[PDB]
Amino acid sequence: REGVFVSNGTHWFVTQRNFYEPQIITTDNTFVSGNCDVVIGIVNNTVYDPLQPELDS
Amino acid sequence: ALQIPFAMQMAYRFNGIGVTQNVLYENQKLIANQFNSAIGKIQDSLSSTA
Ligand SMILES: *[C@@H]1O[C@H](CO)[C@@H](O[C@@H]2O[C@H](CO)[C@@H](O)[C@H](O)[C@H]2NC(C)=O)[C@H](O)[C@H]1NC(C)=O
Ligand SMILES: *[C@@H]1O[C@H](CO)[C@@H](O[C@@H]2O[C@H](CO)[C@@H](O)[C@H](O)[C@H]2NC(C)=O)[C@H](O)[C@H]1NC(C)=O
Ligand SMILES: *[C@@H]1O[C@H](CO)[C@@H](O)[C@H](O)[C@H]1NC(C)=O
């Protein structure tokens, strides 16, 4: 939604463009669009959902 | 100067004109072809119209 995905070599974060500030990737930082068969350079990872833990417990 | 992949640069640029950046990535090949054709047309236009 705002910022870009970066990686410190092992983990992926989403940070604002003009100033490093890594954050855990979640549904509050990313919006879904399309599928994985069209984008070029799309990588694989896991996006932690804030809602899942609340309902699981 | 900070490096950045050209594709992500155009994603920022599209964001700058109120278009969701997913539009660029889903249509990257079309945009590239249109841009190349535009450059070719410019080359043709300059070489003929003084
Ligand atoms: C990339 O950043 C992550 C996040 O800090 C690093 O993983 C953490 O490393 C610290 C040790 O410095 C641990 O205390 C944390 O528990 C780790 N996080 C998780 C979720 O396990 C990771 O090591 C960094 N990678 C590099 C190459 O620097
Ligand atoms: C990212 O993950 C997907 C699966 O979520 C991978 O897709 C696999 O692609 C290979 C090559 O065609 C297939 O044989 C597998 O069956 C696919 N997986 C599934 C679950 O269908 C994809 O290759 C991964 N890419 C990267 C860069 O990690
Ligand atoms: C990036 O460039 C490398 C070569 O340096 C190539 O192997 C890879 O497929 C390219 N990926 C993208 C998304 O352009």
Burial class of residue A38 in the structure, from the number of CB atoms within 10 Å of its CB (0-12 exposed, 13-18 middle, 19+ buried): middle
DSSP state at residue A48: B
| Pocket flag, ligand 1, residue A11 (CB < 6 Å) | yes
Alpha carbon B15 to its chain's center: 13
Which residues of A lie inside 8 Å of B (Cβ-Cβ)? 4, 17, 31, 33-34, 38-41
| Structural method | cryo-EM
Q: Long-range contacts: A32-37, Cβ < 8 Å, 24+?
A: A33/B20, A33/B22, A33/B26, A34/B22, A34/B25, A34/B26
> Residues near A36 by Cβ (< 8 Å), separated by ≥ 6?
A42
Cα–Cα–Cα angle for B37, B38, B42, rounded to 5 degrees: 115
Tell me how far CA of residue A19 lies from CA of A3, B2, B28, in angstroms.
10, 12, 27
DSSP state at residue A21: -
**A12 phi and psi, to 5 degrees?**
-110, 135
